[PDB]
């Protein structure tokens, strides 16, 4: 990317999810005249983020690859997926950390 910044005088680096803004100037050597993030002035809470750390049985859950074949973790994710599918009206997207992890979990869920 060195030729790009040396050639073009003005570059607009924009993205919906890009933070921290101070890393890219460090990781990619370039200087920024302006850099900021805009908060959304929304009348009501349009999105409800949540950080689930435990299952119903109050057992910690993590997707560490070395404990992927753990019945406790696998079941808690499985129950979580079902519960959100029951209350979700139309669409539900599930993102796994790696494809191999997705295969192992799905196979365990099928059994």
């Amino acid at each position: 990317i060195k030729p790009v910044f040396e050639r073009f005088s003005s570059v607009i680096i924009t993205s919906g999810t890009i933070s921290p803004l101070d890393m890219y100037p460090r990781m990619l050597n370039f200087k920024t005249v302006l850099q900021k993030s805009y908060a959304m002035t929304l009348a009501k809470k349009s999105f409800l983020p949540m950080i689930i750390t435990k299952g119903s049985d109050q057992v910690a859950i993590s997707s560490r690859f070395e404990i992927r074949n753990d019945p406790s973790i696998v079941r808690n994710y499985g129950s979580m997926l079902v519960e959100f599918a029951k209350i979700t009206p139309d669409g539900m997207v599930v993102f796994f950390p790696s494809y191999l992890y997705m295969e192992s979990i799905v196979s365990m869920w099928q059994t």
Partner: protein, 374 residues
């Protein structure tokens, strides 16, 4: 890594430590603001409504005590009574989605007793299976075919599930409904659904206000009561026409005679003014010459919709008052901050809060306006 025990004691008692009339007025004014705008929108007095109820596994949920099935059925009975009291000429039909199929429980007719009885029987039936909007809509589409053209087709789906299992493409049914001029009102129970929103919007000429999801038990009754009133029609749609009808005369007879409607012995009845056939009750289509028999009172009940009484505006406190007592009920206005006087624009006569609600809900004519001599 100390636990919460070692930190401190909660000290619950520390949390507790030791204008209403104006609040009610401003709250009423805010509520009255929604009622300020009123215009005589043309509404179809004659209507045919197909009531679709969801009887599926989703009804077994205990969100609405005791269960969704019980509350929906119970409020349906009240809706049937209210619907036929405000609109006497209208006819209604009942459908239920159960076991993935739409099951007819009462033919489209104008007798409230038949629909009430059908709902009563459904009480014991245990909901099961998945709902099917397409099956209910296709059955509703067929039911609304024989209805006369002048009648405004209406469908009131009470949907409770979040997913629909259809045998075909439901989008085709939505297009078909628009072709037949059928308007669908959906009362969701849990959350918004993409197909339900599209069905209501497409069939209501793009209006998105006909799909409502309640938020508590109390709101359900308000949603049910709202559907009782007739819906306005769009300018582009044209259905102007005349309908032949007659007013029979009640006949008293010493000896009972056979009824043409049910072929049963009844002491009294109404003699048709065309074929002289006797009918047990009104208002129903004559069993012989198929002209809808009605009384003048049935038409009268719907007049207030055509010309609604204009909403009253609270008088400012600074301005003087016409009198110290209510014009109609003669109840002294409390001295109290803000004067609690409401005057009708046409006749300029103050009214109390009790009269304001009464004169716009039950009584549909301002007492002062009738008293004023022209």
């Amino acid at each position: 890594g100390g636990y919460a025990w070692e930190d401190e004691i909660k000290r619950s008692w520390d949390l507790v430590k030791v204008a209403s009339l104006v609040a009610s007025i401003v709250e009423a004014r805010k509520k009255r603001t929604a009622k300020k705008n009123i215009t005589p929108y043309q509404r179809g007095i004659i209507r045919s409504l197909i009531l679709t109820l969801d009887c599926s596994e989703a009804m077994l949920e205990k969100d609405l005590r005791p269960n969704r099935h019980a509350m929906i059925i119970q409020y349906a009975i009240d809706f049937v009574h209210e619907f036929f009291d405000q609109n006497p000429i209208s006819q209604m039909g009942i459908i239920i989605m159960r076991n993935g199929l739409a099951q007819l429980v009462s033919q489209v007719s104008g007798n409230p007793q038949d629909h009430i009885d059908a709902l009563k029987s459904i009480r014991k039936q245990e909901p099961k299976g998945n709902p099917s909007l397409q099956n209910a809509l296709e059955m509703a589409r067929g039911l609304l075919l024989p209805v006369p053209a002048h009648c405004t087709r209406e469908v009131l789906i009470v949907f409770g599930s979040l997913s629909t299992t259809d045998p075909g493409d439901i989008h085709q049914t939505i297009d078909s409904l628009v072709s037949e001029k059928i308007r669908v009102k959906v009362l969701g129970l849990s959350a918004q659904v993409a197909i339900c929103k599209e069905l209501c919007k497409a069939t209501n000429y793009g209006d998105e206000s006909f799909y409502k999801i309640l938020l508590d038990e109390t709101h359900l009754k308000e949603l049910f009561n709202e559907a009782v009133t007739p819906l306005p029609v769009n300018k582009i749609n044209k259905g102007f026409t005349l309908v032949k009808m007659g007013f029979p005369t009640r006949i008293f007879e010493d000896t009972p005679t056979f009824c043409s409607c049910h072929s049963k012995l009844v002491y009294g009845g109404y003699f048709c003014p065309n074929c002289h056939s006797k009918v047990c009750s009104l208002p129903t289509v004559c069993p012989c010459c198929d002209l809808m028999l009605i009384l003048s009172t049935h038409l009268a009940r719907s007049y207030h919709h055509l010309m609604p009484l204009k909403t009253f505006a609270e008088v400012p406190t600074t301005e003087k008052f016409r009198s110290e007592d209510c014009f109609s009920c003669q109840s002294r206005f409390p001295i109290l901050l803000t004067s609690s006087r409401y005057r009708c624009e046409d006749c300029k006569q103050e009214f109390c809060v009790d009269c304001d609600v009464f004169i716009h809900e039950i009584l549909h004519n301002c007492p002062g306006c009738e008293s004023k001599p022209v």
